Amino acid sequence: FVIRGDEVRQIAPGQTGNIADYNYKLPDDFTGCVIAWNSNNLDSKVGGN
Amino acid sequence: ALGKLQDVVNQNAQALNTLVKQLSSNFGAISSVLNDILSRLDPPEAEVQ
């Protein structure tokens, strides 16, 4: 999925926020890996994406 | 004379009281009441304490 930079922290176990609460929640016992990379060159429009 | 017996009773009684009183202890938690912590903190935050 795609989020903003400030929301990157929300994607983690034991997190709260708009994204965590309403969009995507991880379990407390989550096992895996989260990888976030900027996609400004891919996901930004001059007029607004 | 009956102290030996009375003694025992008190010990046992004493223990229970101590046990009960431990329920009134923070042990480092913000509060000594689970309901207060649940009502005042979200599960991600509450679970820590």
d(C-alpha A3, C-alpha A23), whole Å = 10
Contacts of residue A22, Cβ cutoff 8 Å, sequence gap at least 6: none
The answer to whether A16 contacts B47, with C-beta atoms less than 8 Å apart, is no
d(C-alpha A32, C-alpha A34), whole Å = 7
The answer to whether A16 contacts B42, with C-beta atoms less than 8 Å apart, is yes
Residue of A nearest to B48 (CA): A14
A11-14: list long-range contacts, CB under 8 Å, 24+ apart. Answer: A11/A36, A14/B44, A14/B47
Residues of B with CB under 8 A from a CB of A: 42, 44-45, 47
Structure tokens at B7: 């003694």
Interface test with B, best of A16, A19, A26 (most B CBs within 10 A): A16
Give, in degrees to the nearest 5, the angle at Cα B43 between A31 and A3.
60
DSSP state of A28: T
Instruction: Say how many C-beta atoms besides its own lie within 10 A of residue A20's C-beta.
Output: 19
Give the distance from CA A46 to its chain's centroid: 22
